[PDB]
Write a protein that binds this ligand. Structure first.
Ligand SMILES: Cc1ncc(Cn2c(C)c(CCOP(=O)(O)OP(=O)(O)O)sc2=O)c(N)n1
Ligand SMILES: Cc1ncc(Cn2c(C)c(CCOP(=O)(O)OP(=O)(O)O)sc2=O)c(N)n1
Ligand SMILES: Cc1ncc(Cn2c(C)c(CCOP(=O)(O)OP(=O)(O)O)sc2=O)c(N)n1
Ligand SMILES: [Ca+2]
Ligand SMILES: [Ca+2]
Ligand SMILES: [Ca+2]
Ligand SMILES: [Ca+2]
Ligand SMILES: [Ca+2]
Ligand SMILES: [Ca+2]
Ligand code: NA
Ligand code: NA
Lengths: 525, 525, 525
């Protein structure tokens, strides 16, 4: 067998059947004779390729395979890799290298010092020392991406390797099963359970690795048994809990002092599947108030090491959440009462308040919709106004890198063909990966894109008002016609300049059989 | 509080009370006002500092703290770090940096691009962005070294940071408890246990992480229940099993074909706490024969990913070994019968055969002796001839980097003051870290050093005879007087030119109250 | 031809005929069939191998070739590489890698992520992607080490590459000539020359790249023409000027304020072949006083970029020094008058003052002696008391990394067989690379080693008295018998406990036909 045949056999035997890519000449020997049982999803720029793959991996809860062109293609994708690192996304990023005979002379398209290029944003990065090693290196990549804590990995392959003969011992790679589905030993787990059973006023904080593990329902059971309020850890990349469950208390503010004040009076705070904590604004104060202790369950040693407070347990979130939910006692405390519904903000017949937009989406979207957020100044309102009952219902760029939601929403919609995906994206953010729209059109992936158009980088302008920072350049983005951009890439486009038009456009988009972009005129901040 | 006071408080609160070091001016602000409850162990060169610390950490099964001088001191230690990486040794390596005000100009003693220097041999490498971050960075270092898979870490600290004020919120670092004591979830553990119960002819292979976890006794129970032969994985850094237990089958040959032939006919091979596998010679063939399947339990994702065959489970070795040993059925198969004793090799009244040396050590050493091996051409005979009943009884340079055993034997003897340490070191290997002898003399650490003097790099000369490689330079090391070197560093020295003298020298060394070096004239290979 | 034959042909065609090494199994396929026209210099530990090679390269003013064993051997050498980076030493460091077929599994002795290991201490670091690329990669290494600014480079080679067939087009590598012998264009050089001609009170500061370029005599002509005082830039690795020439003013103090005070009143300060500046102690103040401007000529862009003041020209030091010395006018100012001789310090019949030692060396050593300094508390006195008339007469560890002078003095003596090398090394420093003595004995390289024994790390104890730092551990090194260490490695040894014995020992050492070590009892600081 050839390295090509052996590698595709390893991929299919490990569950991989889709290649997200933007091709180049170093990759043609890999992509030739593309197997009939695989599919190839083309995107027009590499941030879009990796964003699509990332949404697909996060929603499918399985690795996604990517093929990029040498250094330039890899480089175009590295902002997307920054988000994938923070979301623990299992991405297998491959890139083609020059033929081994011209690597030394640095022919055009040589990826120099290739493994260092995507660092520090990958768990593992490698170029094999010979063609026959390529299947084993690919096996390493698959398992490194997939073991907890999951994350992106990178493999560079000289184009001449694919046609060489494979090692006949590579067959042992095909069916390897590697598990990291582990939980704390019984003695120490019993100590943790007793601590939770004994707490007088416990609180629970959940992060994105809960939703990645599909541990959401177990965490509902845990919160019901402990009769504990549940918050989502700050800067949340995913939604780990039903947002109208009586225990739910919302998204935590991303500040040190704000979080310790919020947790004041809780004697034990159990954090599951989050860093401790993804703060954003600098809000100095106490990490925890006197009387509060924190216990973190994380899948990532790097998270456990850097937490500034609390105990930690490094283990699989699915296994831990299941064990805790089934072991704790039912507290005799009263179940927390549900948060009240948000108020309706006054809305005239002009430009839309973001609150109106989210209320109307919540009114009209199916109960199993999936939302993506890259409307950076409206995140708090979004989290208050969307009832998200089910797992896998929310994605936000985990490293704060905009240009994620537009392509990721296409990958999520590909992963979940029976759940309507609605991406809510600011007019600034929409441009970063605008060309991803073409992939939705070409493959008829029926994502809905709601562009919140207020003409400015609102989140920045706010943080500039915060600091009384005068004379900051570059905050306004006037003069973009998003319906013409959608037409450019073959996507049906609608405009909503007021509420009546918003409702009508959403009704049309929800009935449509392909992707739709709605440009919404929103109020200036 | 100062950063200095806060950092030493964090160290003591996390169980650290000893600094292994070789000082320099960037470190004086850290070492000044050295706390009375700590001790400082000086060694004369940094390979020796880190080797001593490494033996201390491996034998104590806890992290060791190291302080080195800037780039040059760190650099002198990087061969020692290569072994520590392969042995999973929890080493906290700190190095002093120039004052922040002259880092930019690259004053003398600036460690340029410091965090990149020890890569790729550390799990985590960092320089803090401000003085007040130093305690948190030290907390990160402690936990990164200590979480599974354990390993060395590196922290660079500008010398002006120590006297600055600490953050009052650093107190939350002091008592953090971080656990990685995890095992496979119940459902999948039951599947593994059923597979072991069902095997017709299981074999067990153990590596160094068994001894690190003190999982040895559990692995004895497991092997007794399964009635299975037990081998030690190749290139063994530690001894994970009593070597005269009836199940014991010795050290595996470090070759692909040799191992698959050895395992032929075993239907299930359970590997615990080893890479799969640390081969050495290239001995191409099948990874496993038809009829053999392999299951690996490893504490290290990198090991699970790179295994060329078998299933893997990434979990804590102590937790897994305990759970398996207590869950498996007692097989009705007959217990394996013990290997016969090794034969006595003929010995005249001249230079010593290595076999004679090991037999005589086994005859005379206490039953709880601890051995170190850096006599590279005699490893197989050593493993056949020393009865090592207890855990923590054997160390060999895990990356093959000689210069480990002499200093490590001093650290092991410091960790285990009531177990006699006997390091068996070739005349070539003895030179690499010869100055470590001084630390044994100064602190009166009573290690015994047995120098196997045959005048040549025997293991190399053998691998050169193997390849029929003629005209290789640099293989002979004539003209070294090891008793004069020992005298140079204050260690009592004896010579053994024949068996009578070997016996007499060992009797004197075993009765001595300080370190002793015995130079043994061994046969030329 | 094989890769082996082609590579040795490239080496000989590029002027390389010596391999400094400590062998291992990954290197046996390179070292087998070692060519008859090459020589191999063995040292017993890799810091010693690289130190010897470094002294040889610096004194010969040509690249030196090194062969080390995998990661552990490379790692043992990285403190030596830190000095070589600061001295711009042209070192070609090669290390053997595992066979390509087992790199993936990480067999014992695999150098993982090899090119990252010696970073950031090398100019270029590489592992070739195929056997046939090895000669081209070696060509790259030779030229990268040798082009200005010279420096160490690293090449990792899988052991199976050597026996493979070479590319027949590799012959084009053999006779490549690469030049960096460049100087500032005529128009701008005329502007510089006019600035020097016009200065009212110029000063000249010289660094180690002057001595590397053998630009010393040109700099004497330049200073005579400009009638300018000459200082050596601080932390000096080499001596760039005759130390009793009337213009000579000594070694600059390694402090910001001290240097600007020294230069006060000089209108133009021309620095040649030095960083601006290698300060050490933090001595904050003005970089330059009002009225002083600085112009630096450096071979290293990194030096030009990081200078905190002055103009800079990046060019070859030999070409620039020659052009300036021949273009400037003869000033009508009076030539500076020579510094007076140093005073004789009072000396009783007991332990030796370092000043007495240097005076006696100056009295007895040949006029073309070469000195090395690793007696860190006595550097100022050494520079005052040794008349060094000739180029290549002084070496000091350029990164401050002790363990350089003992092995480097053996390499320098090998490079300069007709100039007596005298290394003056403190008792602390002597231990770091003590095993290098064996190479002097084995090859009969007649270096003289003068050990300054005061029982302590004196330079540290002084900088601890400076800071009033109490309770610093690890500063004393009692209990070392250096005559027994020398005997251990086959070197004749003498002791000098007073002046009469110092004189007698030096007379015996200077007449000896092999290496000699003199242990001198010096006063405690
Ligand atoms: C890749 C990238 N570039 C720039 C930024 C900085 N940035 C910018 C430019 C934001 C403005 C997004 O504007 P928007 O129109 O999408 O939404 P809002 O008006 O609601 O803020 S939010 C933010 O963090 C970023 N996060 N990521
Ligand atoms: C740091 C380093 N340098 C070089 C080597 C290469 N090497 C060398 C030089 C060995 C010879 C050791 O000789 P010895 O006298 O200690 O023992 P034997 O004579 O029994 O081989 S074994 C080996 O792997 C190495 N492994 N590690
Ligand atoms: C490789 C390394 N380790 C440690 C140091 C720190 N250090 C040490 C330990 C010195 C003491 C040298 O003592 P010595 O006996 O050689 O000479 P003095 O007594 O004259 O200082 S000087 C110095 O910078 C260093 N520079 N380089
Ligand atoms: Ca098909
Ligand atoms: Ca906007
Ligand atoms: Ca004490
Ligand atoms: Ca030997
Ligand atoms: Ca010859
Ligand atoms: Ca001294
Ligand atoms: Na990079
Ligand atoms: Na490095």
């Amino acid at each position: 067998a050839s390295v090509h045949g052996t590698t595709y056999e390893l991929l299919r035997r490990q569950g991989i059947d889709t290649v997200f890519g933007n091709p180049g000449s170093n990759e043609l020997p890999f992509l030739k004779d593309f197997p009939e049982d695989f599919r190839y999803i083309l995107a027009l720029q590499e941030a879009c390729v990796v964003g699509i793959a990332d949404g697909y991996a996060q929603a499918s809860r399985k690795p996604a395979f990517i093929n990029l062109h040498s250094a330039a293609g890899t480089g175009n994708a590295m902002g997307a890799l920054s988000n994938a690192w923070n979301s623990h996304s299992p991405l297998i990023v491959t890139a083609g290298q020059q033929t081994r005979a011209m690597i030394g002379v640095e022919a055009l398209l040589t990826n120099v010092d290739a493994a260092n290029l995507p660092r520090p944003l990958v768990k593992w990065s490698y170029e094999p020392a010979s063609a026959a090693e390529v299947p084993h290196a690919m096996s390493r990549a698959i398992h490194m991406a997939s073991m907890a804590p999951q994350g992106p990995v990178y493999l560079s392959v000289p184009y001449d390797d694919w046609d060489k003969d494979a090692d006949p011992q590579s067959h042992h790679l095909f069916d390897r099963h590697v598990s990291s589905s582990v939980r704390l030993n019984d003695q120490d787990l019993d100590i943790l359970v007793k601590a939770l059973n004994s707490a007088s006023n416990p609180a629970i904080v959940l992060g994105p690795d809960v939703d990645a593990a599909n541990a959401n329902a177990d965490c509902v059971m845990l919160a019901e048994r402990l009769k504990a309020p549940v918050w989502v850890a700050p800067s949340a990349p995913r939604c780990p809990f039903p947002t109208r469950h009586p225990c739910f208390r919302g998204l935590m503010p991303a500040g040190i002092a704000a979080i310790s004040q919020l947790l004041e009076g809780h004697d034990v705070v159990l954090v599951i599947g989050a860093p401790v904590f993804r703060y954003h604004q600098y809000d100095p104060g106490q990490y925890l108030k006197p009387g509060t202790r924190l216990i973190s369950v994380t899948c990532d040693p790097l998270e456990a090491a850097r937490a500034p407070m609390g105990d930690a347990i490094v283990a699989d979130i699915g296994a831990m959440a299941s064990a805790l939910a089934n072991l704790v006692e039912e507290s005799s405390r009263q179940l927390p009462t549900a948060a009240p519904e948000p108020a309706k903000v006054d809305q005239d017949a002009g430009r839309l308040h973001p609150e109106t937009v989210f209320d109307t989406l919540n009114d009209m979207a199916p109960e199993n919709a999936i939302y993506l957020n890259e409307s950076t100044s409206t995140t708090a309102q979004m989290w208050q106004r969307l009832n998200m009952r089910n797992p896998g219902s929310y994605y936000f760029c985990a490293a704060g890198g905009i240009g994620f939601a537009l392509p990721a929403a296409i990958g999520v919609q590909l992963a979940e063909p029976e759940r309507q995906v609605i991406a809510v994206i600011g007019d600034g953010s929409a441009n970063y990966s605008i060309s991803a729209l073409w992939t939705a059109a070409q493959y008829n992936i029926p994502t809905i894109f709601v562009i919140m158009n207020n003409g400015t980088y609102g989140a920045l302008r706010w943080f500039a008002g915060v600091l009384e920072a005068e004379n900051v350049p570059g905050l306004d983005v006037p003069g973009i016609d998003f319906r013409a951009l959608a037409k450019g890439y073959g996507v049906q486009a609608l405009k909503a300049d007021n509420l009546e038009q918003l409702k009508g456009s959403l009704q049309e988009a929800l009935s449509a059989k392909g992707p739709v972009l709605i440009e919404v005129s929103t109020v200036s901040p």
